[PDB]
Amino acid sequence: EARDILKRPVITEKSSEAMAEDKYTFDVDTRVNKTQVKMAVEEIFNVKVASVNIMNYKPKKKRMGRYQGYTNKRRKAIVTLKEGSIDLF
């Protein structure tokens, strides 16, 4: 279940500053809670989690040509480790 909870890492300027501060940003399944996120990270990466922050992103308006629709809604989790680190390369 844990590898379903964690979808992908998020790579941005703000996420990179977070990684400099030992915070790792993941896109997670939109149904899971932050406790599940913490358990999944601990299990997958064999690290210790200090805290997990979470937020939702609404669908964003997007178009190509005459077709206007929306992107997928997102759930973003920021995981603060107390022990260890995660190698994304």
Binding site: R3, L6, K7, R8, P9, I11, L88, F89
Partner: protein, 64 residues
């Protein structure tokens, strides 16, 4: 792959399911960091999981 999967035992198929899911998850992380360069492995691993779950489901229905 189904013919080869059917040669595996029940405990082996579960182990294959776990290991395939880990491989797929590793592929997804590599894709998100722009490191993959081999994107056809993703579909191949996904269908292997589908075949593995199909064979397990057949055995349980057959035995039941």
């Amino acid at each position: 792959k189904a013919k080869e999967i059917r040669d595996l035992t029940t405990s082996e198929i579960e182990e294959q399911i776990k290991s395939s899911k880990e491989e797929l998850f590793n592929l997804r992380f590599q894709l998100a960091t722009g490191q993959l360069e081999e994107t056809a492995r993703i579909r191949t691993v996904r269908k292997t999981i589908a075949r593995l779950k199909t064979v397990a489901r057949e055995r349980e229905i057959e035995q039941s």
